[PDB]
Amino acid sequence: MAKSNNVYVVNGEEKVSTLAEVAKVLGVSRVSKKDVEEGKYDVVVEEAAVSLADT
């Protein structure tokens, strides 16, 4: 994940401001900021409108 206004896309679906969203699709428990920092999966991070950035 919950950032100021940095939001993600649930593997190309819904937009949520917390990586717990993708964890649903990724079949994982609570994949969070480690995904962003370690680069686990191809999740996109952008303020509000994502799916074309991944900051």
**What is the residue extent of each domain of the chain?**
6-47
**Alpha carbon distance 4, 27 (integer Å):** 26
Q: How many residues does the chain have?
A: 55
- What determination technique applies here? NMR
* Sole residue written with tokens 């079949």: 27
Residue 24 C-beta-side C-alpha neighbours within 13 Å: 13
CA–chain centroid gap for 31, Å, is 9
Return contacts of 33-39, CB within 8 angstroms, 24+ apart.
none
